[PDB]
A paper describes a structure:
Here, we study the kinetics and substrate specificity of an AldDH enzyme from the [name] fucose/rhamnose utilisation BMC, Cphy1178. The overall structure corresponds to other members in the [name] family, with a catalytic domain (residues 238–427, highlighted pink), a cofactor-binding domain with the Rossman-fold type nucleotide binding architecture (residues 28–108, 127–237, and 428–447, highlighted grey), and an oligomerisation domain (residues 109–126 and 448–462, highlighted green). The catalytic and nucleotide binding domains come together to form an extended nucleotide and ligand-binding tunnel that is open at both ends, with the catalytic cysteine (C269) at the centre of the tunnel and the NAD+ cofactor binding at one side. Cphy1178 forms a tetrameric quaternary structure generated by crystal symmetry, with molecules related by D2 symmetry.
Numbering used by the authors:
A (entry chain A), B (entry chain A), C (entry chain A), D (entry chain A): 29 to 335, 339 to 462
Write the structure that this text describes.
Amino acid sequence: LGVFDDMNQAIEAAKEAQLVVKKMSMDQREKIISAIRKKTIEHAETLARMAVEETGMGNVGHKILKHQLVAEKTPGTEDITTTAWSGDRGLTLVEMGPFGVIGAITPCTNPSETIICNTIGMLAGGNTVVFNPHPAAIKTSNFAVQLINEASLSAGGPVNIACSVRKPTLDSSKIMMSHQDIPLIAATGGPGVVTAVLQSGKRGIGAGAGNPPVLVDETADIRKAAEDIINGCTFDNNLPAIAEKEVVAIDAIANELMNYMVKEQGCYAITKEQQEKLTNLVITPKGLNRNCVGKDARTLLGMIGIDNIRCIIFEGEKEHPLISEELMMPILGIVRAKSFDDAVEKAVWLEHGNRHSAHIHSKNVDRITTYAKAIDTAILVKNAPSYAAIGFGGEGFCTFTIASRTGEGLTSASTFTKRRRCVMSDSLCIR
Amino acid sequence: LGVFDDMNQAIEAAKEAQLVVKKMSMDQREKIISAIRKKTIEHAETLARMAVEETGMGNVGHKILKHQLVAEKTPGTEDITTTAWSGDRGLTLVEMGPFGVIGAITPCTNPSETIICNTIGMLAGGNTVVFNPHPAAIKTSNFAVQLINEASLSAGGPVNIACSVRKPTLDSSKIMMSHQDIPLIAATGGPGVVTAVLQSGKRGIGAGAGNPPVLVDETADIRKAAEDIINGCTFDNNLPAIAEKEVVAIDAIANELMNYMVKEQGCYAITKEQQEKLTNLVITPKGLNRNCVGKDARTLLGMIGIDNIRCIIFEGEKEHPLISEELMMPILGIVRAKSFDDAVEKAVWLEHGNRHSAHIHSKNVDRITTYAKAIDTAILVKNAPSYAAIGFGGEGFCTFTIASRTGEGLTSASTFTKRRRCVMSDSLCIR
Amino acid sequence: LGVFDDMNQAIEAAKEAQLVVKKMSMDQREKIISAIRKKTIEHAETLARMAVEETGMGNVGHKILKHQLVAEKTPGTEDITTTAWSGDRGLTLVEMGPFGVIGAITPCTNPSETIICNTIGMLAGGNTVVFNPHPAAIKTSNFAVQLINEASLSAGGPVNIACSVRKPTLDSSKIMMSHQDIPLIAATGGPGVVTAVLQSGKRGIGAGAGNPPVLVDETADIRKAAEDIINGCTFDNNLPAIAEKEVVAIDAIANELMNYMVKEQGCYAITKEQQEKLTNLVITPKGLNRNCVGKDARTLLGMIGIDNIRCIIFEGEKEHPLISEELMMPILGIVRAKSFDDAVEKAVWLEHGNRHSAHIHSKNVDRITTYAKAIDTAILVKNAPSYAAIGFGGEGFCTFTIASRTGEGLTSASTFTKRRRCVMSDSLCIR
Amino acid sequence: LGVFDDMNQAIEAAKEAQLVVKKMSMDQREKIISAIRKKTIEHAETLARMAVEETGMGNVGHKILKHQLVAEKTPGTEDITTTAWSGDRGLTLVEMGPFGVIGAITPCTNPSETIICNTIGMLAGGNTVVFNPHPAAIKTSNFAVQLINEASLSAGGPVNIACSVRKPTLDSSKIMMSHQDIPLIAATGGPGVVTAVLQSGKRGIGAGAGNPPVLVDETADIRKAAEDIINGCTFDNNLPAIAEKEVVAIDAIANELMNYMVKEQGCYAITKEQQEKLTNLVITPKGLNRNCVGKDARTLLGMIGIDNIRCIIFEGEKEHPLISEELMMPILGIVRAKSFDDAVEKAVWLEHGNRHSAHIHSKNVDRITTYAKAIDTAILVKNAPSYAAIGFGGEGFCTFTIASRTGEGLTSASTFTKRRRCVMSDSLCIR
Ligand SMILES: CC(C)(COP(=O)(O)OP(=O)(O)OC[C@H]1O[C@@H](n2cnc3c(N)ncnc32)[C@H](O)[C@@H]1OP(=O)(O)O)[C@@H](O)C(=O)NCCC(=O)NCCS
Ligand SMILES: CC(C)(COP(=O)(O)OP(=O)(O)OC[C@H]1O[C@@H](n2cnc3c(N)ncnc32)[C@H](O)[C@@H]1OP(=O)(O)O)[C@@H](O)C(=O)NCCC(=O)NCCS
Ligand SMILES: CC(C)(COP(=O)(O)OP(=O)(O)OC[C@H]1O[C@@H](n2cnc3c(N)ncnc32)[C@H](O)[C@@H]1OP(=O)(O)O)[C@@H](O)C(=O)NCCC(=O)NCCS
Ligand SMILES: CC(C)(COP(=O)(O)OP(=O)(O)OC[C@H]1O[C@@H](n2cnc3c(N)ncnc32)[C@H](O)[C@@H]1OP(=O)(O)O)[C@@H](O)C(=O)NCCC(=O)NCCS
């Protein structure tokens, strides 16, 4: 249901559906969107269980919360807005119109979250969407597509507002990328897929990688910073791109911070020898060990023969491979800094020019400003866990497509629209 | 001044300048922008004369007005705006940050207009820009770059906020497109350059082609529609992408309309035989005749041995090559329509799926709506000349980079920025 | 529950509640607001029945729809918004803070609609409210107050977010008006109460009277204009201030229009003699006959011995007392106009400088503009029934407090807040 | 020129002018506004000198800067904005229309600043204005009116966009307040005039009094706080309502702060005996000594026989009459606080429920938030002089009419407009 044997079929189906969607009222779109939100909540446990079973990554309870967040806080048609300028020369409107059929490449970390979040946004703007799901999360992804189409059916149709394929491949992704009925592709993934999309001759909205540092200075609430940082790091076993993945801590509070992490936040400190063993396990000749990504801390420790604990920590240099590299594992090094400017320099290196996400615990407005300016990320969270950036304990809406590479930031319905100016000359200014 | 021997030098220079620009206050940027506006006005006659002399296209008086429009109505730092959401969970800001060094590929139709308009916008957002000017308008383009740098010098620097090269080529455009210090390219030109940009692995903001129809229905002010349409068509000899390039007229008013065009608007009606000769002249085995593009009507008529007149008109079918093809010449066919829905169908075919610009003369709100929905263009002008779309007799700002292919519409400073969300958790909501 | 024996008690109670509300999160306010919306829908039939029984005015089915509209389309906390300006000099925020305890004077036409609509808006902005209900609709009004407090209790409190008195009087309204703990009064009623409020030394948000003309010109869809106009006029038996209360029709379509009204819209045309009898009935030495206001057409006709029909119509001069005077009865005179400018002149006289509401059926953009500029009302509806102005078949939110006298227009949560500027100097601009 | 013998003449003249202004284009209004800005700058020295000579208050150099600020940063027609909502049900616009002729009551502290600032704003929205100037600043005020009319003449008229009377009185203010052609009064003054305006049966936009505390905590940059606070306090000899008028300082930094004030900021510390003499001088049986208001510190000290120095300071209790009372003199008491919460409590008492202005020097986000929430003022400045609140070293526009009593905050053009909703049903949504 919405799932096809080949990519050309999927696209044609979505194209037919879009002729209806584009003519639907906002109330009609919103009825479908409401049905999607409801079904996402109703089946959050199933979606969450499916992802862990299929990919081996993450954990069920956190994926339930992520789907609840998508359902509650993804913008709908209220995100489609109009500007008006009027005067003696008349009325000029700027509207957000559909692109048409949008292609979307989705990850195996937040598979159904991305699919459902993209769909709500894209439908609100009058589009339909065709997915090429990640090959490691195909069943989970297509289940979400099927749910979306059931929701639309329950609200009177049409079917195929979201489409996918049974056996997504590099080849089927290439059919999408070169298909002339797809004017826009939303690429949520790694530099591999995204560069390909930005080489397609289409507009591409491109997520990128991150390696988010969290800087803690001596003005911070250190007890709360420990709680926030481990909560954010270990959320869905560090799978989210936004999650804290290393700490830069001012010398004077580093011991207090790590002590709290061990004593109150379920962190286990590993020795140099244990760091060496863990490094050899999780970084391989083929790169990141796929058998380790998104595993919980107790499992990773077990894998190297070390038997409550939810995070692995240690103090190290920024160049340490478990600190400099984005692991998507609950492994969190603490880098000690001599001074604030030292700390900012370390955090900037650690972010690696991704301009994705960065975090700080500090009560000082000048410090916060300095860091924000220097690090220049799509996301900056101050005195909360990273997930405050997508509306979990922070103001603002949720997305799972953070267009750090192409600059649109946290994408929503308005992102996936074409701008149209309508100039009504010398009339309809009523003033 | 701002002009370099090779593209790598240009880019490095712009990159150095941008480290200063990004740290400049809005007042500092605006001082430079004001100086640029002033200099553009001061040298509009020179820029206009240079373009006609160098390219052989357009006319001086209209290019003066286009530069005046750029100077008066291109947005500056006021276009860089901030959103805030606040509540018990604190304060979330969304800001527009710089990309960095932006590459820009510019046309030979509105060469200096595009360069100056792009620069004002890009500087406002904290960027610098490197141009690869059109090879047919190199001297005009680089003069504009030099003016921009003189303006910046007059306001205290820095130099190289806008850079270019002495001898732009396909090769130098390729250095820009593949340069890792350029994260964004603004491509103002034809499908050739734009597709290349959208294959570059960078975000590309892409202008496209158009073929703007103007539909006149029987409710229109026909005398004024004749005036508006010929004024818009013949503006800078039909060079602008937005200009009217064919008419679709309801049968009942078509004769009245064309009569007005001949009697009051300086139009000359050509016979079938003359249409045939003109077609053979302006469409060639190599495509559009470069020796004809942007020539005035008296010149084009002279070229086929026909000796006040500012536009060539005739009645014909939509498929007629002087009607279906975008000529950028003051040649305007009138296509007769049986009914409104017939007229909309003809206009939609004639726009060729460019979703660029379209125009209508009608006083009927339902008719206007029908047409606007069906034609789905970045620009729709109602009851005015096309140039009302860029702020000449219409509400709204000016641009010369209309991103019809990639969907950003009429570009301005905000277009050329990265979005950043800053989440201040549990503080700085003062309510 | 929320209802007190005397006004000073009510105000103190609301004042205590407001110390909690102002510190509530938007999510907490919205939980209560959601409960209020739900309860309003659940008890819409009861509220509607109570009003007709108590006041003798209006009709139950339409009052059900009015309460559904209030519940669905009154803005909540989303209407409380923040502006931000940032640059080198730091960050400036403008926020909407509470006034405190707001007093409100409400009508007997839309009693509970006004109370519930005011409360949702006022609560969203951090205020509480104290009502002095209309003495003709006390039981209906206080039932609505009780419902509001039940909703708040169901969501965890506090009680007394809305308060009222058991026996509202002119005297108790004067205690409210002169009470130093009430910095703002929202006055929904007649010139009597509103002027008193604007003499109170407090800010007053003041509804005024109207006499809304609907102009139909020869370009209109006349069959649909007949339907829309009688639907709008007869909605809740013409009680709403926005409702059509006289027609100005271009000569050429007047007969067609009235024919449709009689043949398809349940209108009964009265003779001059019948007009005379009806005039003597409904206009009295004491003014409008209270026994006639808000009665259906069949009843009014019966009252003068005339026995499907839902509206009384006739053709007459603008000065005819059943045309020039706001009756809040389904009595609708048609004034014939020679020309558009004649029609605009007649409609402007008929609106009596209230600048409240006016309506037009016309497909011509210039005509619409002319009329809109000339009539200068808080509300102008084009080609729909009047109730499109409050979100019933038109874009936009619902209100029952239209501040035509003081200029705030269709009031909502943002209306009832104080503006606060917060200047964070030389920090927290992250760009 | 714009100045009349009696108030009825002034109002009729303004009423005639407004029929033209309301029909003027934004470009036409802005041409006049530009001329007003230019003339204000050109004659700032004259306006400044006139005020000091006439009233005996303030100082010329600071009044020059205040007029430069008015000219540069008062919003014009860009502050008049439009909202649009569109969908299947059509297009709804909300516009800002004129009130008409606005009455304005202006002060003798910032006489011409208020007049010019009000006029720019009011003209932008399509209004004209009639002033009743303060009787102590009549010549200065009417000079400003004359300048405004010269500016309008220079831009082609009309004359009388701003009107005044030769001999303003309580009686002429009452003619304005009760005049039926004035639907709105902007009252910039003391509780006396404002309450009268809020008793007039008109909408009144009401400035109120203040007594702005500046709280300095132990996290502040104390050297800079000393500079900022004395600069803000002593600006135009403490005449502005926004200016710092007492300090609440955390014990631990109070001595450092006052030491800096004496050593670097030209403060003179007075003994208890000198405080007693100064109190007897400046507070009298008739209230504030008019012969002392707005005098410089050297003069006030001289007046009690005490002979570089620009501010008088001393440490005292909050109830000390030179601390608790708003003096509009460069007299600044420092109140010592035991703790932050103590300091907030003291500052809140000192503001006296005016909800006007308050200030803080602190680098701590939580502290700032606590204070902002507790003090609930129209203006809160953090880590700058008070005048950052009107755009002098802070983000945001300038006003001299801060509607603290009625809640509109820092008034501008949009403040002085009526809101109009225009519902275009089932057309002109182009999506
Ligand atoms: C989670 C992860 C380790 C799983 O690895 P995996 O199972 O081997 O799958 P991969 O993502 O490496 O991709 C396998 C191949 O399919 C491609 N691919 C990825 N997503 C695809 C999709 N929807 N559709 C089609 N092909 C896809 C990849 O490019 C790759 O091809 P390649 O061999 O030419 O490089 C990996 O996806 C990853 O590291 N993702 C992080 C990217 C990201 O968004 N990071 C921010 C979050 S912290
Ligand atoms: C005006 C015009 C007829 C002049 O033609 P021209 O002098 O032959 O120049 P061209 O634009 O055709 O380009 C010549 C070559 O340089 C390329 N080129 C164009 N702009 C370039 C630029 N800034 N920098 C480097 N190369 C450029 C072209 O791709 C082309 O290469 P190709 O042979 O591989 O196709 C032509 O530019 C044109 O038709 N432009 C319309 C595009 C447009 O924006 N239309 C909307 C306005 S109505
Ligand atoms: C419906 C209506 C005819 C009922 O008349 P009514 O039962 O006699 O009640 P009234 O509104 O005339 O008011 C009776 C008295 O109580 C006053 N009053 C009205 N509302 C009051 C309220 N909430 N609380 C206290 N007193 C109120 C009135 O000022 C009046 O006092 P008065 O004798 O000094 O003038 C009358 O309210 C009316 O005409 N309202 C229209 C006002 C309006 O908003 N029109 C736009 C809608 S079309
Ligand atoms: C500066 C000041 C001390 C000068 O005092 P003044 O010369 O005696 O003039 P006043 O303002 O006291 O007013 C004198 C009388 O004219 C009235 N008045 C004030 N402004 C008026 C105006 N434009 N037009 C007509 N009457 C006016 C006053 O109400 C007063 O009448 P009253 O005797 O019934 O009370 C006094 O105006 C003042 O204290 N203003 C502060 C109000 C304010 O805005 N404070 C915030 C700034 S810190």
